[PDB]
Each structure stands twice: as structure tokens, then as C-alpha cells.
DNA sequence: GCGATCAGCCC
DNA sequence: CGGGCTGATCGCA
């Protein structure tokens with residue numbers, strides 16, 4: 086049965102009620118400077134569809150959109166807010182976002198459209214976006230009659246589903262998480278995305294030139310050593326050269342052929358000079374294709390800025406993800422790739438990049454939740470946690486900790502957070518399961534509180550069916566009861582890791598909210614640009630650095646109060662690279 | 666074209 | 677052993 090609604094040619098007062106479900110449709114996946122194809126409004130007075138050129142040109146409608154006292158319920162309000170920012174229109178008063186609501190209730194559902202969210206409550210009087218717009222090359226906006234009914238049905242679903250979703254969030258003790266954390270954060274992310282990050286394209290282009298030269302040299306050297314030319318970028322062709330023509334040992338295989346991952350190649354290096362060249366080629370090629378070419382493809386020609394989109398409702402742990410471009414995985418470990426960061430610069434003259442990061446937030450969170458006396462004491466003394474772990478598991482004094490011991494203790498600490506496993510640790514340290522198991526046992530002997538926590542959290546996940554974070558984020562783990570060892574073990578590691586990674590996500594998200602409030606109160610021009618899981622990157626006038634050096638770490642350190650202190654390091658400079 | 670496979674970058 | 681995104685190649689269409 087078709088849904089009734091008014092296909093309006095003009096905006097009326099009835100459409101501007103102080104409470105409504107609103108749909109500002111942006112079909113393009115990347116909504117930056119994207120078209121708004123239609124608008125739907127559902128309120129106490131009825132259901133309405135408005136053509137964008139009409140509504141967005143109407144003073145009354147624009148004013149309604151920007152009035153904080155006029156409450157709107159939406160799905161993915163950030164998408165609408167940003168698309169409107171590019172049009173110079175402010176969206177305020179969004180009191181409920183169905184996308185974020187669904188995400189908090191169950192991240193695993195992968196809710197990506199109104200239909201998916203509605204199906205959670207047995208509401209199916211709305212079609213999936215893909216069914217309406219199609220996919221890939223076939224994607225397209227349908228004729229007005231079809232478009233209008235779809236947007237109205239989506240607004241109608243939001244209107245009907247708000248109460249049921251809020252009720253369940255309240256039962257889950259997650260309503261404040263939505264209203265005081267995720268929704269306010271959505272607006273902050275919208276500002277960050279819209280501001281974008283300035284890129285020194287000339288810098289990138291020059292790097293690309295030099296890489297091309299280096300790649301040419303290495304490429305030829307490879308063919309020389311192989312005695313023939315082939316596609317190095319083809320694990321298939323490369324495998325034949327290495328394991329068949331050159332007869333190198335097959336230390337590991339892939340489900341479809343020979344493994345050629347860096348991990349394996351490093352072990353084969355002693356056998357043939359071609360290996361190091363392949364590794365070098367892989368390194369340069371990664372920088373060239375993914376970072377130089379990749380970044381240049383998404384930089385806006387007119388402003389020379391890149392505008393990422395932070396997916397706030399995707400990860401199973403509460404973290405954000407970044408796309409087109411992903412600015413959360415810019416090289417830093419290796420000097421060559423690290424130089425790419427010199428291309429990320431302040432958007433204004435005489436401004437600088439300021440970066441602040443939490444020091445070991447995950448292990449500090451673990452110390453807090455596990456209430457491990459030894460681990461808490463370690464952080465209260467602000468000790469080098471890896472050196473400390475080495476001293477405990479290897480039974481030696483600080484002065485007796487060798488570089489290799491610290492390196493292995495560090496790997497153990499990662500495993501503990503990820504959800505320890507002899508097999509996983511062994512592969513990482515290139516040792517045996519028996520040996521790796523010995524490290525684990527020694528770790529738990531030194532940190533019995535952590536052992537108790539790991540045991541207890543797994544039991545809790547099985548009993549309740551899910552685990553939670555400091556701010557009540559939730560993750561269901563149905564596989565925790567599986568009779569399949571591999572499937573069950575993965576779920577157990579998730580039970581151990583989610584509260585840690587998840588709570589760290591909760592903390593930095595609150596820090597971002599607290600920070601923006603402080604920056605506004607202080608009337609600073611500084612503003613957030615990026616978040617990279619445990620770090621915040623801002624840009625600001627050089628005259629604001631001294632104030633930021635005190636303000637940013639304090640706000641981040643005081644976001645939440647744990648049984649151990651939170652510690653934040655910071656750096657600033659002329660480019661992201663120099664913010665070290 | 667579309668998508669599984671393999672690779673490698675980040676925290 | 678935890679959580680992500682993107683680019684290359686290549687079978688399949």
C-alpha cells in the first residue's frame with residue numbers, strides 16, 4: 086500500500102513544526118560538496134516531500150534547519166550536516182540519529198541504511214537504499230515519484246522508530262552514550278571533515294618523481310637478478326621466479342599459492358640478492374601507489390585540501406575509521422614513508438600543526454579494569470612499561486634488560502591486549518608455541534590481576550552474551566559458546582580485547598567533546614583536524630601554541646578518571662612531519 | 666566493468 | 677594473538 090504524502094511545490098508553516106523526522110538525501114557515497122537530491126519531512130501535521138532547490142532557497146526553511154529549538158530525528162545526520170555546510174547552511178537541533186542508535190545497540194548488524202535499522206524492530210515498510218538507487222555503475226537517482234516515496238518512507242520509519250530505539254538504549258543504559266557522546270561527536274566530526282587538511286601537492290609531486298626514479302632502478306636490478314622481466318606486483322609471477330626459477334625455500338604458503346609477504350621474504354634474503362631488492366621495491370611501490378598517487382587523486386584542485394569521511398558507525402569496538410582518503414594510516418614507522426607527512430601542512434599562513442597522543446592508553450585502561458596491583462603501580466610510577474614487563478617475566482633488574490628482551494616483552498604486552506594466544510604470539514616473535522606459552526604463563530604470574538580479569542571477562546561474556554566498555558558501549562559475542570575451538574577462541578580474545586580497545590575509544594571521544602568546548606570557551610582559533618585512535622591532530626595560529634601545550638594534554642588527561650593517571654605527550658611544527 | 670586474494674600501511 | 681582502508685593482479689563476466 087502506497088504511503089500518503091504531500092509533494093509540495095512550496096514550504097509551509099506546517100512543515101516547520103518543532104519536532105520532526107528529517108531526510109536530506111545525499112546519494113553520492115562521498116558527500117563532500119555533493120548534491121542533495123531531495124528532502125522529506127514527517128511531523129505531527131503529516132508527511133512532506135520538498136525539492137532541494139525550493140526548500141534550500143526558502144528563508145523560513147533554512148532558518149528552521151538552523152534553529153536548535155526545532156528538534157529533528159534523522160539517519161546519518163553527519164552526512165546531511167556536511168553536505169549542507171558546503172552549501173553554507175547550518176543544521177542544528179538534531180536530537181536523534183537512528184544510524185548511531187542502531188550502531189550502539191549492535192555494531193555487528195552492520196546497519197548502513199534506514200531499512201536495516203528498521204528491520205531490527207520488525208518494521209519493513211521501507212526499501213533498502215541499494216534497491217532504490219542500485220549499485221556500482223548502475224547506481225542512479227530514480228524519477229521523482231519513486232524518489233519522493235522512498236524519502237518519505239525513510240522519514241516515516243525514523244519518526245516511528247525513535248521511541249523504540251531510545252527505549253532499548255535506556256534499558257541497556259546506553260542512552261547517555263548516544264545523547265551525550267556519539268551525537269555531539271558527530272557534529273565535531275562534521276566540522277573536522279569540512280575543514281579538511283591542506284596538502285602541499287608540489288611536495289608530493291616531487292616525491293613521486295624521485296620515487297619513480299628509484300623504482301625504475303630497483304625494478305631493472307630485479308629483472309637483472311632474475312634473469313628476465315616479469316610483473317613484480319604479481320605474487321603469482323613473483324612466486325614462480327622465487328620458488329621455481331631461483332629455487333628459494335618455501336617457508337610458508339597461501340591458500341592459493343606461494344606466500345611472498347615481507348615476513349617471509351625477510352627470512353629468504355640470505356639466499357639471494359633479489360629478495361632485498363623485492364622488499365625495497367615493495368616499500369617504494371607502496372608509497373608511490375597508495376600515498377603519492379592515492380592522495381593526489383582525492384586532493385581538491387581548488388583548495389588543495391583533502392576531506393576525509395570518518396565512519397562513526399562501523400568498527401566493532403567503537404573506534405572511528407577514515408576513508409577517501411584514509412588519514413589514519415599515513416606512514417610514520419620508516420623514515421622514507423614518514424617524509425610523506427611533510428606534505429600535510431597548516432591551512433593558513435603562520436599556523437602550525439599540533440599533535441597530542443595518549444601514552445599507553447590501552448595498558449592503562451587494562452590496569453584500571455583489571456585492578457592489577459603490579460600494573461597499576463607501574464603506571465603510577467610512570468615506568469617504561471615494556472622494560473618493566475621484561476624485568477618481571479624474565480626475572481632481571483632494570484639494568485639487565487637487553488634490547489631483545491624489551492622487544493619481546495613489548496610483543497607480549499600487545500598480545501595481552503589483543504587477547505593473548507600462544508600460537509599468535511609465537512608467529513609474531515618467530516618462535517614456537519611452547520616457548521610463547523612460557524612467556525604468557527610468566528606474564529600472568531607477574532600480573533595476577535590481569536589473569537583474573539581475562540578469566541572473569543570471558544565468563545561474563547558467556548553469561549551475559551556480550552561485553553561492555555567504560556561508557557557502556559556493547560559488543561555481542563555469540564561465538565563465545567561455539568564448540569569449535571578456533572571460532573570460540575576468537576570470540577574469547579574479542580571478549581578480552583573489546584573492553585580495552587573500546588574503553589580507549591570512549592575516552593578519546595569524550596576528550597574530543599571536552600576539548601571543543603574548552604577551545605570555544607577560550608575563543609581560540611585552534612581546531613581539530615584528525616583523530617588517529619589515541620591521538621588528536623589540530624592546527625592553530627603559531628601564537629596559540631603555548632596555550633595549547635597546556636590545554637590539550639590537560640583536557641585529554643582529564644576526560645575520565647581512572648585508578649591510574651592518563652598521560653598525554655605532544656609536539657608541534659610547520660608540518661605534520663615536524664609535529665614530532 | 667565486479668569481487669576474491671594478497672599485500673602493507675596505521676594504532 | 678585485536679581493530680581498520682586501499683591498491684595491485686586476475687579469474688569471470
Ligand SMILES: Nc1ccn([C@H]2C[C@H](O)[C@@H](COP(=O)(O)OP(=O)(O)OP(=O)(O)O)O2)c(=O)n1
Nearest residue numbers: 254255257258259260261262263555556557558
Ligand atoms: N543511562 C545511562 C547510564 C550510563 N551510560 C553510560 C555513559 C556514562 O558516562 C557511563 C557511566 O554511567 P554512570 O556514571 O551512571 O555509572 P553506572 O552508575 O552506570 O556504573 P557502571 O558504569 O559501572 O554501570 O555509562 C549511558 O549511556 N546511559
Ligand SMILES: OC[C@H]1O[C@@](CO)(O[C@H]2O[C@H](CO)[C@@H](O)[C@H](O)[C@H]2O)[C@@H](O)[C@@H]1O
Nearest residue numbers: 114115161164197198394396397398408
Ligand atoms: O555517511 C557515512 C555513513 O554512511 C554509511 C552508510 O550508511 O557509509 C557510506 O558512506 C561512506 C563514506 O563515503 C562509505 O565508505 C560507505 O561505503 C557508504 O556505504 C555508514 O557506514 C557511515 O556511517
Ligand SMILES: OC[C@H]1O[C@@](CO)(O[C@H]2O[C@H](CO)[C@@H](O)[C@H](O)[C@H]2O)[C@@H](O)[C@@H]1O
Nearest residue numbers: 539540541543544547565566573574577
Ligand atoms: O580454566 C579454564 C580456562 O580456559 C578458558 C580458555 O583459555 O575457558 C575454557 O573453560 C571455561 C570453563 O572454566 C569455559 O567457560 C570456556 O568456554 C572454555 O573455553 C579460560 O577462560 C579459563 O580460565
Ligand SMILES: [Mg+2]
Nearest residue numbers: 442443444445
Ligand atoms: Mg601513543
